[PDB]
Amino acid sequence: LSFMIGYSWTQTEPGQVNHILDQFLSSMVREAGAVNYFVLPFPFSEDRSQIDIYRDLIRSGNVDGFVLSSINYNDPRVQFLLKQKFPFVAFGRSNPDWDFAWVDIDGTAGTRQAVEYLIGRGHRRIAILAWPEDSRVGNDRLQGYLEAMQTAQLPIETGYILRGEGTFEVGRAMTLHLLDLSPERRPTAIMTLNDTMAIGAMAAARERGLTIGTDLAIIGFDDAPMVQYLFPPLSSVRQPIAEAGRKCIELLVAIVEGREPEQKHILLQPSLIIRASEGHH
Amino acid sequence: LSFMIGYSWTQTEPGQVNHILDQFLSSMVREAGAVNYFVLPFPFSEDRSQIDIYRDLIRSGNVDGFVLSSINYNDPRVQFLLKQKFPFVAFGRSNPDWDFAWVDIDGTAGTRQAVEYLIGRGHRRIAILAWPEDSRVGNDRLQGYLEAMQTAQLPIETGYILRGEGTFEVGRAMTLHLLDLSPERRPTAIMTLNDTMAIGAMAAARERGLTIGTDLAIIGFDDAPMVQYLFPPLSSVRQPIAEAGRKCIELLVAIVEGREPEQKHILLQPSLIIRASEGHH
Numbered sequence: 001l002s003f004m005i006g007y008s009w010t011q012t013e014p015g016q017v018n019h020i021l022d023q024f025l026s027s028m029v030r031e032a033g034a035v036n037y038f039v040l041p042f043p044f045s046e047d048r049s050q051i052d053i054y055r056d057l058i059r060s061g062n063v064d065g066f067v068l069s070s071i072n073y074n075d076p077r078v079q080f081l082l083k084q085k086f087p088f089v090a091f092g093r094s095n096p097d098w099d100f101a102w103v104d105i106d107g108t109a110g111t112r113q114a115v116e117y118l119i120g121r122g123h124r125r126i127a128i129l130a131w132p133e134d135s136r137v138g139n140d141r142l143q144g145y146l147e148a149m150q151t152a153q154l155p156i157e158t159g160y161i162l163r164g165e166g167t168f169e170v171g172r173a174m175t176l177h178l179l180d181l182s183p184e185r186r187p188t189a190i191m192t193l194n195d196t197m198a199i200g201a202m203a204a205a206r207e208r209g210l211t212i213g214t215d216l217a218i219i220g221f222d223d224a225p226m227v228q229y230l231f232p233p234l235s236s237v238r239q240p241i242a243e244a245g246r247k248c249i250e251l252l253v254a255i256v257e258g259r260e261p262e263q264k265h266i267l268l269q270p271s272l273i274i275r276a277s278e279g280h281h
Numbered sequence: 282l283s284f285m286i287g288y289s290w291t292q293t294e295p296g297q298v299n300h301i302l303d304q305f306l307s308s309m310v311r312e313a314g315a316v317n318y319f320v321l322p323f324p325f326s327e328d329r330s331q332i333d334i335y336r337d338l339i340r341s342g343n344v345d346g347f348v349l350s351s352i353n354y355n356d357p358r359v360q361f362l363l364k365q366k367f368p369f370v371a372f373g374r375s376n377p378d379w380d381f382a383w384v385d386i387d388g389t390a391g392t393r394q395a396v397e398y399l400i401g402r403g404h405r406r407i408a409i410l411a412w413p414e415d416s417r418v419g420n421d422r423l424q425g426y427l428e429a430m431q432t433a434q435l436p437i438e439t440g441y442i443l444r445g446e447g448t449f450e451v452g453r454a455m456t457l458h459l460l461d462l463s464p465e466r467r468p469t470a471i472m473t474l475n476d477t478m479a480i481g482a483m484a485a486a487r488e489r490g491l492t493i494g495t496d497l498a499i500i501g502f503d504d505a506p507m508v509q510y511l512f513p514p515l516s517s518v519r520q521p522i523a524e525a526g527r528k529c530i531e532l533l534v535a536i537v538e539g540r541e542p543e544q545k546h547i548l549l550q551p552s553l554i555i556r557a558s559e560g561h562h
Contacts, residue, residue, distance in 0.1 A: 011307070016506060019506070021306075021307075030324050038322070038323065041306070041320055203512065206512060224507070226507060229298070
């Protein structure tokens, strides 16, 4: 054993409000350290198909396993490591009946809970700022919305489901499009797939003279640092990134040391954070 | 050579808007990789005096050098590595005539520039939300303010220099204290030592019915992601964290490989980011 776990992360877009690198990596580093392991960061290949670096690290004997993040459908990195029978844990699922060790956050449960909360306040025209169809995480989160709306038997309007990049600009543009609707057809609540989008929605609401919360409710996703300081403070879905980090290391170390548990699929639940004038419940 | 550089970072307080771990570490990882080196993260000891982990990593031969961040005055880690004659580069100075290799951002120049800008708009009552006296970075940044005010020959009021923790709560409290002053004595502009503080100031201004920018100008520090999305968007001092990361690796690799340059002190300049209704200049 080299007592080292290889890790890499996708380049953070300049303009994204959330950076869970700190929560995830810090957590892994401290957890690994407790059991005498080190996390070895290596350059990420934006073209996930290029697995050369993985190939190199394996035969160099510099690591005993890998932790993968930013998992897409049919992830080439997952395919490769599976073929090589090399130890690894993916932080995020990929392809339904594709088998391997993983830790993930129940995105679906997150949005479902958020939507149920809005319905519980009496909201009936709820829209969502979602992501493209090729996004695994996006579909999970969107699914929760569909389920909650279906269960409450509320209309699921195609005009209320806008797909695009998770940016401030897109969030704002899509919301302005929705606010262009008359009071009768305009949604009273908007669910977004990340806080950056929610901020754009807040900007759009402000531009159109609507009071956030009262006239237009907004719930984001990933409870990025500082969203709590906005006015009104932003309600959002928080994911247990630190715990997920700890679970990844914990599961990979067990696999690397030959004592793989029967529970190689760890699904963690997110928490809905509702914020009012001050303090969240 | 082990071709590995050890690095560790202080635990990010829950509630801080900026996380330069991503900019700094990502940059180091990619730079090291280009010259065949890896960055090896190890658990940070909040009690900087406890240098055991450094002692262990050196004789284990697992690293050829270290990069240090969160440098305080008379930093025990710097003292130790200096005694051990072990390669290291500090990201941040410590103790004036204390000698060693380092890369740092000219904090003083950052605030001076910010204050000069405010004076250039005609501001004469400018206050600052600063940090405690035992903060090396705090004193550097505060120094720039004093210099600019002194140069423009404007009053340097003790009532306008409030020291405390760089939090939202403190920034807000200190600003409300300042806004308690009548229009005649109230400052027209506020400089803060980090964006978290500036956000609190923005919250205070909002609570007291003042238009940010027009009635009360605010300039923060570290241009954390998303401050650009606030209303009004927040002007702030940006530091070249990625470049600093690259310079650290670059300087340490040279020292580790026996070809230490004569320029072992690298001081980088920050940039003032002025933002208006949309787009920054």
